[PDB]
Symmetry: C3
């Protein structure tokens, strides 16, 4: 099985930045009524998509008291739970984060370790890369993710 | 075998929106020489790409007189015709549709069914997720797709 | 094993365009401290991602005398070395190139031949499709790639 997910969030100055379940020091952060964790959102969508379960707007809306205000990791674990109940075993996750600031390189180890712990995958099965948009999207964080299961 | 494809079109008011082979209610439809069915196009390119066959610009360049107008379903099924002729069996398709308006929630089941129909795949092997552009691309519809075969 | 990678570079008028390791006659070329080869960069990242080796910003920075000034194909070959020393066997690459000008169609055979040579894959396992941004990104070249190994 395969899944593909994408997520993007406007960035505003002085908001906290969350990626891969972590708080990342940054002059900018997700402007939205989520934590705007683009990384986990794309990953979550990718998991749901692999089983035709819908997407995070459908399963985790802020109109539901279960899900409103929850950390994005909560959604991810939920999606993990759902596809495992259908037989899924997650084997690999590869994703790309695009944002003109801040620099994520110094946070590489922590981000990869977090995804490893939240996805329960070995580090060599976590494919994380960092890019800038070269000014094509200087006010947004974008994530695109592919997952492979059994 | 895997394939990856993308498509986008400018959106315009008073225009007809086709998505996944359906006519959808919106202020805007695609500004294209075709029906601008970004979902079907991305999927066609992903299929062609999985066998190195080219892309829709190549195989469907309108100048031929049996492409003018034609529905994008024609393109999709020809691509299906070609990979199966090369021994392929399509197993799964996972795509993301990006568009600020209109909202695709109310058309989700119909959209899946159609892809189920056209791709001759089971519901749980059609991974369709919907996203907004967050102001990055307010005037376009975007689709990106991955396919898995054999 | 699967890997997903992206790259995008600003296009400037008057600068040389390099795609898939080839010089492409064009009014625009990447404005980069590299050769701005979006195609090879996204492929390189996808390969590294498949083994969690990091990304080209990490492995091939211009801070490092061996990599500074080098053609992008040099990085791609090193990434192929790295994953093959981890036992990988590249099976397939599928990428999409997006740019508003120039037209890549007349160059398709050469670009595909370049990638089959560089990746050591037969042409039917090189999936290359060409798109414009429909005016969404008219000053950039964008590349997104999926790789499959073993």
């Amino acid at each position: 099985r395969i899944g593909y997910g994408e997520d993007s969030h406007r960035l505003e100055e002085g908001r906290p930045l969350y990626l891969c379940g972590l708080l990342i020091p940054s002059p900018v952060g997700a402007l939205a009524h989520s934590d705007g964790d683009a990384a986990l959102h794309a990953l979550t969508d990718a998991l749901l998509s692999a089983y035709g379960l819908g997407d995070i707007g459908l399963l985790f809306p802020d109109t539901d008291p279960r899900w409103r205000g929850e950390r994005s990791e909560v959604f991810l674990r939920e999606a993990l739970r759902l596809v495992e109940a259908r037989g899924a075993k997650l084997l690999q996750a590869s994703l790309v984060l695009t944002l003109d600031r801040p620099k994520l390189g110094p946070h590489r180890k922590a981000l990869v370790d977090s995804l490893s712990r939240l996805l329960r995958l070995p580090q060599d099965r976590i494919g994380l890369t960092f890019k800038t948009s070269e000014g094509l999207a200087p006010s947004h964080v974008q994530a695109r993710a592919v997952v492979l299961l059994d």
